[PDB]
């Protein structure tokens, strides 16, 4: 399409359209050319006779006399555009309407996606100031007061008004430059804190613990020892039903100070819990109906995770079946060293605890150490014998 | 073109109603395109896509055209549905130069869209009995002379006319009968003699078959135009200065 | 809360959200990473396809269209930043057959 | 994808989450039909001719 | 009150981490988790003045904002608290609330900043 | 006919016993004799191992079209 | 509008195809703080176009000049939109009186075709008062307020059209189709 | 803070309208173009639909009409109404 | 007054009836779901009459039980016009007089319908009657009476949908006519 | 007896179409139209101003407040938006190369 | 829930009480388990419309009695709306033949009202 320069439609001229100014766009229809001078610009040229009388300094630019887009003049043109053209601009006319691409109102966001101490959000402190330069302009120009000003006061509104979408602008002249950073929409949508890498993709978890790691070579290779304190922390809520009934009456008599002892009751209907430290009585334990579900202590043969913090491979984190055992640290049998690549001269892991039947099953299945044995980079193994057994 | 369209909408509903307005306004907003495209984007039976169609082209509201690989187009024009809000200027003015037969031609040629000489005479005559009792009756010959006049006088213009059959391209027809508009018989009436006396309402073949007619907007427009300058004259100096414009 | 002054709660880095891709635990690493952690509740208007309150759409003055759903804070919460941005997030959705 | 499926809190589409499972009940499809004896067709007939 | 027993118990108390409000009359729980900010923004937190957030020290006239200088470095001239300043400013700034007080001469002024 | 693979695979093994795990917590009827164990998942397990569970897997082709499958007729293996 | 006073600086600035406020106030009679307003209001609306040539290549407002500028044929395209939405909206206006007091309107049709039946047929007078005895006979000067607003509405409409002929015989004759 | 309501008044008026015996005429010929457009076929309504019961007045009541067809010569051999 | 209607639906059964064959289970909780409730454009419901299809029964991700769509059918009472009617009365009113048919309470016969020569009572609310000959404007409609013919005349459903964000008159109600000889109480014919 | 209705209105995503809000659906969407500059009253209360910003219309983030729009505290409150009008229309960083 | 048909066939006093009929045969078979009130709205509205049912004139009518009648009602060419009612109502007397049939004084005569009237007392 560029190359063409007469609108067929109405044998319109157009020039080209280009950038003026930091967010300031002209067109070049009135251009002078090295070429046999256009009729229309000569018309052009010669109808500023009154100002260049009045004012001295026209005649030397008024070879610079250019339409310059404003806003307003681009919004009453894309206004006007045809419906049957729309699509061929790309656009879906279910998305939007050119029209609407220029912008005239905003939404303040809600309370929630800004707290009330940061004492405020920049981003409240950029709308006080965005509704206070307004109500300048609307004032100002009702007093009635020279052009100028109206108009450079809106070129500070709407610099304001693109910093306050993204605050990286390097545009801006040195006497109105930022003094202090900010934190404009995409700053807080980009960045390594921003949504996606810090809060979408990975994220804190909770049931979880950490500590320093020991050696044990008493456990099976597919076991980990874990500490009393640790145990009494978290829990798995093990619905009732007509096999377990009796178990977690048990559980539920020992409370929440001797191990095997459970943290919580939810009742079947009626939702709310029942913080067993304060229950008077056992008779919770004769009142367990079908369905109630008892937050229970965890107890020898739960599936927990297991990972060391700088994974390279999918040997680093590796499903375990527990034991509850009354030191303060973790402990595993030292052929499993080469998987985490751990040395106990000081390291640390974690642990998680999964909260739903469906992934204790896929734990269980896919992840335990007894299905990797071998690591599937090439099939070589990678749990064998380590030093001092080879010896 | 946003705000034309509703008035599309509006004077659609307003003429032939919501089926009608549907077809409408999603052909002159989506352009020229073969039937069975816009029969799968409204979803509702052919039937009523190629009943409105039949009624608008009637009308000459839309226009279809042959295009490659054997499809037919079918398309409408956003100007002629803004007229119908001047028919009653047309009909005044019309009044104003001719008598009540020369209004009654022009109402039945703008309600029907397109009509010959010998039935619209007569569908003239049948509702201009009603306007005369007590023994009073017309014959075909008033009529016809106040037909013959106004179409001398450019109002009334031919409709196109489709290309001989055994002329041109014998066989199997095309998609489309491709018609063909013809310049030198604009003005030129075909002939008649019949005369017929109206039934007034008592409850108790076609010489000019295919000279179809419509009437001739631009002459219309012309002569507003023509009517508006006359008025700024008189405004600006005089009544006598204006008769000389 | 990531302290440990103030309580704490481990994180499951971009590094582990791949090592089980690697072993294609579906269940699991929805368990971890929904469940557990920002589980929510919304009501979405079918109608405009944009989200609302209490069943009653503000947009549309209507309640016959609203339906609920399940879905991150932090994905609600983007949704709120790009319709104030003036990027909408038109959101459809159907049965779950 | 597995990344948009990851933020929007629904199983990914690999793995363990790429079929469907059905429950073997006890049970009889398109069962016999309960009779109906008042509205049956040879006992109507349109009046216009 | 208890929404299962309507006792009006409630103790305010915590598991080893979890903040929670429980009935000690049954043994319920009726609200616990609690959300915080974090030491990563603390090192973030600035501070605006009340007057600043609320639409005020934009009014002060020359005179005022002159006085107001005023009062300051004469109280620290003394090697005065700060809370003999602050004091000295809210009262001074009480005090030009006054017509009277607002519209007069500076030696007056000055006097009643000595006061 | 039925055109893929005999065997059951790890997937498959993996979301049949958690998904008969969470029907057992549910108070369903259990369809093994059971010796005293608790945790619902040894009790999937021993269902399978006597090819009792009442699951049927249904298999879906890229394009469209799917095979049934019962899971006591692919050939459970170590 | 505007009033005579506002007309009479539009005409100016018009005729006027270059020019700057001062010499609008000393020209156009106008007092000070009473002119510059005004101008704003029409520059606001775009009836009036500027055009801003500079006093220095980057165009800057501080470094420009005010000339205000018409284009007519600008001009005439907005008031064909505004005529289009204006007769949109009263199509709607009237269809919604219509469609909120056809239940009125039935309710009358069906007793005024029942009083105009039965008519020729010689049937007794004893139902012309006797029909006339319900609510509709004191609501029928709300039905002549109704039919009036129709009325009315329609010579507004009617008016309009007369407008547009001229606005669009202009729109046309300026364009030349090529 | 009382943002201002939904209609500020305006001091110009709609200049009153123009009224005679043409005029008059005018509307009432607009009248009774609407009227005309709901008395033939080219008003093109939704087919008749959903009856409840076999009621017996459908015998006497029902609306008997030609089939509309246009002249066929005149358009696409394609869209018969039957 | 009895229409039979088609109708779809998905299901869902708990685990704990797995035992049970499962039509019977998708029958039990169909007429547990709609039984004795009024839909908006087919009136109220009595009863599903038969099952016609089922489709397999998925279970979905997190969860226990199975779901089911269901093809059924149900025999739902909606009256057309015209219908003649046997109904005990239920209470009068100035307005009209309340008839009930024993599931169903919502019919009133307007005064428009009542015959011409009684149009209102002595200040008590027991409508009476009035006759030309016999019958001197003494006999009166009993708040309960025999089960009187009437017939339809009109109908009408009204929407009870939540409005607003969250946080009595039923949706259906008919109108009766009496006019015509041979109708109303028995003993009159 | 009452009108019958659905209980379990559950379902599942299934596209995300992106676009663009005009003023006439930025208005419709918002619930008040923000004019005043302030944040608090002035009085020692400190509490926001009716129609300034922070305007609890908005929903709320302070413990004890709860929301106006909704009757619900903190931890329920979806949120809800306010809208700002602006006198001179000016450019949109991100579409501005559009 | 969704509707695919809203009058897809009529239905007379009989089916209905010989579907409540083998619902009773079901019902009180065995102990109420008190699940739901949706027994009590169910139970309601079904021993509602047995007691109803029960004062009605088609209690001990069978399908071929009932077919019988209409196969002999075939040949007077009412509408099916009409022998519904007739069905559903046994008249007994002309007067309110006089009211149930459409155009009853144009479309019959009195001999043929009176054999439909004596069709229906006879063999009902
Ligand atoms: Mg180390
Ligand atoms: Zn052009
Ligand atoms: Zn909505
Ligand atoms: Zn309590
Ligand atoms: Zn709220």
Not at chain 3, 24 to 36: D, K, Q, W
Not at chain 6, 43 to 56: D, T
Not at chain 7, 11 to 21: A, G, N, S, W
């Amino acid at each position: 399409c560029r190359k063409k320069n007469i609108c067929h439609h109405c044998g319109a001229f157009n020039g080209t359209v280009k950038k003026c100014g930091l967010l300031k766009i002209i067109h070049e229809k009135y251009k002078t050319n090295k070429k046999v001078v256009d009729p229309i610009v000569s018309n052009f040229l010669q109808s500023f006779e009154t100002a260049i009388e009045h004012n001295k300094e026209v005649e030397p630019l008024l070879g610079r006399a250019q339409e310059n887009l404003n806003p307003l003049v681009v919004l009453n043109l894309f206004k006007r555009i045809p419906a049957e053209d729309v699509p061929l601009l790309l656009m879906n006319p279910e998305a939007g309407k050119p029209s609407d691409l220029i912008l005239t109102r905003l939404l303040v966001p809600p309370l929630c996606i800004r707290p009330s101490v940061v004492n405020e959000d920049d981003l409240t402190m950029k709308l006080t100031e965005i509704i206070f330069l307004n109500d300048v302009i609307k004032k100002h120009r009702i007093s009635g007061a020279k052009t100028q000003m109206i108009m450079e006061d809106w070129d500070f509104l709407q610099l304001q008004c693109a910093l306050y979408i993204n605050s990286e602008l390097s545009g801006i002249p040195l006497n109105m430059a930022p003094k202090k950073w900010t934190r404009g929409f995409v700053q807080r949508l980009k960045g390594k804190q921003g949504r996606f890498r810090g809060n979408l993709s990975g994220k804190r978890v909770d049931f979880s613990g950490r500590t320093v790691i020991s050696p044990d070579p008493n456990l099976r290779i597919d076991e980990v020892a874990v500490p009393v304190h640790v145990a009494k922390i978290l829990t798995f809520p093990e619905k009732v039903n007509k096999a377990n009934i009796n178990f977690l009456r048990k559980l539920v008599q020992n409370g929440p100070e001797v191990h095997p002892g459970a943290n919580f009751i939810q009742q079947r209907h009626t939702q709310m819990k029942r913080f067993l430290k304060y229950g008077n009585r056992e008779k919770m334990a004769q009142e367990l109906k079908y369905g109630d579900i008892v937050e229970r202590h965890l107890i020898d043969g739960d599936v927990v995770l297991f990972n060391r913090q700088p994974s390279l491979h999918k040997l680093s984190i590796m499903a375990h079946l527990a034991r509850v055992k009354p030191h303060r640290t973790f402990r595993f049998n030292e052929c499993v060293c080469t998987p985490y690549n751990a040395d106990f001269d000081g390291d640390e892991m974690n642990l998680h605890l999964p909260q739903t039947e469906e992934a204790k099953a896929e734990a269980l299945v896919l992840m335990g150490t007894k299905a990797n044995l071998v690591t599937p980079r090439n099939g070589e193994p990678l749990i064998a014998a380590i030093q001092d057994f080879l010896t | 073109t946003q705000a034309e369209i509703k008035l599309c909408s509006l004077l659609l509903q307003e003429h032939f109603g919501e089926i009608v307005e549907k077809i409408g306004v999603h052909l002159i907003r989506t352009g020229s395109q073969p039937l069975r495209v816009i029969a799968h984007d409204t979803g509702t039976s052919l039937d009523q896509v190629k009943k409105a169609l039949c009624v608008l082209v009637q009308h000459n509201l839309v226009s279809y055209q042959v295009h490659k690989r054997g499809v037919v187009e079918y398309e409408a024009q956003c100007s002629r549905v803004l007229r119908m809000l001047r028919y009653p200027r047309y009909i005044y003015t019309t009044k104003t130069l001719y008598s009540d037969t020369g209004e009654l031609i022009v109402e039945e040629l703008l309600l029907n869209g397109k009509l010959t000489m010998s039935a619209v005479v007569k569908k003239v005559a049948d509702r201009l009995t009603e306007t005369m009792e007590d023994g009073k009756t017309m014959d075909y010959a008033e009529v016809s002379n106040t037909f013959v006049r106004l179409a001398d006088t450019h109002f009334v213009q031919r409709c196109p006319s489709v290309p001989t059959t055994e002329n041109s391209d014998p066989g199997p027809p095309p998609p489309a009968p491709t018609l063909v508009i013809n310049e030198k018989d604009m003005y030129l009436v075909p002939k008649l003699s019949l005369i017929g006396k109206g039934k007034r309402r008592r409850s108790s073949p076609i010489p000019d078959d295919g000279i179809y007619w419509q009437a001739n907007l631009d002459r219309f427009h012309q002569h507003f135009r023509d009517q508006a300058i006359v008025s700024a004259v008189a405004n600006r100096m005089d009544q006598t200065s204006s008769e000389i414009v | 809360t990531e302290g440990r002054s103030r309580d704490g709660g481990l994180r499951l880095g971009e590094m582990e959200r791949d090592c089980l891709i690697g072993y294609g635990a579906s269940m699991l690493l929805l368990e971890r990473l929904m469940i557990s952690s920002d589980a929510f509740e919304v009501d979405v208007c079918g109608q405009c396809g944009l989200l609302g309150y209490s069943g009653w759409c503000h947009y549309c003055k209507s309640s016959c269209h609203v339906s609920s759903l399940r879905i991150p804070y932090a994905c609600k919460l983007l949704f709120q930043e790009l319709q104030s941005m003036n990027i909408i997030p038109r959101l459809k959705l159907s049965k779950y057959n | 994808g597995v990344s948009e499926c990851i933020i929007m809190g629904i199983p990914m589409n690999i793995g363990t989450g790429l079929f469907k499972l059905l429950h073997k009940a006890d049970r009889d499809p398109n069962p016999p039909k309960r009779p109906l004896i008042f509205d049956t067709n040879e006992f109507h007939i349109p009046l216009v001719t | 009150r208890c929404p299962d027993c309507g006792s009006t118990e409630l103790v305010e108390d915590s598991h080893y981490s979890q903040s929670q409000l429980v009935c000690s009359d049954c043994g319920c729980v009726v609200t616990e988790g609690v959300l915080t900010t974090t030491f990563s923004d603390e090192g973030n937190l600035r501070e605006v003045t009340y007057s600043r957030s609320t639409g005020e020290n934009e009014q002060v006239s020359r005179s005022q904002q002159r006085g107001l200088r005023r009062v300051r470095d004469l109280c620290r001239v003394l090697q005065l608290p700060p809370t003999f300043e602050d004091t000295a400013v809210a009262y001074y700034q009480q005090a030009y609330r006054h017509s009277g007080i607002r519209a007069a001469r500076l030696q007056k002024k000055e006097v009643l900043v000595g006061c | 006919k039925r055109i893929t693979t005999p065997y059951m695979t790890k997937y498959e093994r993996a979301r049949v016993l958690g998904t008969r795990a969470l029907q057992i917590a549910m108070c369903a009827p259990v369809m093994v004799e059971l010796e005293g164990e608790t945790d619902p998942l040894l009790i999937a397990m021993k269902e399978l191992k006597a090819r009792k569970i009442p699951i049927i897997i249904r298999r879906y082709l890229p394009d469209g079209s799917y095979e049934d499958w019962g899971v006591d007729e692919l050939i459970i293996t170590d | 509008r505007f009033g005579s006073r506002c007309a009479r600086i539009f005409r100016l600035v018009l005729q006027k195809k270059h020019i700057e406020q001062k010499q609008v106030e000393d020209f156009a009679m106008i007092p000070a703080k009473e002119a510059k307003d005004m101008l704003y209001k029409m520059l606001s609306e775009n009836f009036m176009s500027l055009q801003e040539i500079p006093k220095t290549p980057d165009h800057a407002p501080s470094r420009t000049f005010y000339l205000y500028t018409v284009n007519i044929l600008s001009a005439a395209r907005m008031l064909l939109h505004r005529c289009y939405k204006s007769i949109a909206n009263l199509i709607e206006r009237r269809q919604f009186e219509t469609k909120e007091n056809k239940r009125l309107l039935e309710k009358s049709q069906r007793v005024e075709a029942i009083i105009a039946s039965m008519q020729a047929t010689g049937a007794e007078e004893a139902q012309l008062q006797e029909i006339e005895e319900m609510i509709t006979a004191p609501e029928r000067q709300q039905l002549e307020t109704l039919k009036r607003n129709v009325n009315k509405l329609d010579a507004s409409e009617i008016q309009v059209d007369e407008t547009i002929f001229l606005l669009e015989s202009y729109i046309e004759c300026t364009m030349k189709r090529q | 803070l009382k943002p201002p309501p939904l209609f500020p008044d305006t001091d110009y008026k709609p200049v009153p309208l123009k009224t005679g015996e043409g005029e008059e005429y005018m509307l009432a010929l607009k009248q009774e173009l609407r009227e005309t457009m709901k008395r033939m076929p080219y008003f093109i309504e939704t087919p008749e639909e959903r009856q409840d019961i076999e009621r017996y007045s459908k015998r006497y009541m029902k609306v008997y009409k030609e089939e509309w067809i246009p002249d066929w010569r005149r358009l696409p051999r394609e869209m018969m109404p039957r | 007054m009895f229409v039979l209607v088609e109708m779809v639906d998905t299901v869902r059964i708990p685990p704990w009836q797995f035992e049970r064959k499962l039509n019977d289970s998708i029958a039990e909780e169909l007429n547990k779901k709609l039984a004795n409730k009024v839909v908006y454009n087919v009136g109220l419901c009595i009863c599903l009459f038969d099952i016609t299809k089922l489709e397999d029964a998925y279970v979905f991700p997190g969860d226990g039980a199975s779901h089911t769509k269901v093809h059924f059918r149900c025999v739902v009472f909606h009256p057309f016009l015209d219908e003649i009617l046997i109904g005990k009365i239920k209470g009068c009113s100035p307005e009209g007089v309340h008839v009930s048919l024993g599931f169903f309470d919502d019919i009133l016969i307007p005064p428009e319908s009542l015959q011409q020569p009684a149009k209102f009572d002595e200040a008590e609310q027991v409508w009476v009657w009035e006759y030309e000959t016999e019958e001197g404007a003494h006999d009166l409609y009993m708040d309960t009476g025999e089960e009187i013919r009437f017939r339809v005349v009109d109908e009408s459903f009204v929407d009870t949908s939540p409005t607003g964000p969250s946080s009595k008159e039923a949706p259906y109600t008919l109108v009766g006519s009496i006019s015509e000889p041979g109708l109303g109480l028995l003993s009159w014919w | 007896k009452e009108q019958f209705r659905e209980t379990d209105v559950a379902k599942k995503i299934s596209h995300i179409c992106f676009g663009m809000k005009s003023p006439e659906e930025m208005r419709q969407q918002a619930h008040i139209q923000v004019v005043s500059k302030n944040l608090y009253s002035q009085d020692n209360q400190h509490a926001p101003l009716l129609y300034g910003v922070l305007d609890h219309r908005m929903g709320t983030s302070e413990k004890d407040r709860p929301c106006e729009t909704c009757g619900k505290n903190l931890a329920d409150c979806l949120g809800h938006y306010g809208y700002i009008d602006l006198e001179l229309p000016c450019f949109h960083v991100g579409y501005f190369r559009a | 829930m969704e509707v695919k048909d809203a009058n897809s066939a009529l239905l007379s006093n009989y089916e209905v009480f010989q579907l409540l009929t083998d619902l009773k045969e079901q019902r009180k078979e065995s102990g109420k388990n008190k699940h739901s009130s949706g027994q009590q709205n169910l139970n309601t509205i079904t021993y509602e419309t047995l007691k109803y049912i029960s004062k009605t004139p088609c209690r001990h009518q069978s399908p071929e009695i009932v077919r019988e009648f209409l196969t002999a009602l075939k040949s007077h060419k009412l509408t099916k709306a009409e022998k519904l009612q007739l069905l559903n109502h046994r008249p007994v007397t002309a007067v309110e033949i006089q009211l149930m049939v459409e155009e009853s004084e144009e479309r019959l005569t009195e001999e043929q009202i009176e054999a439909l009237l004596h069709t229906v007392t006879s063999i009902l």
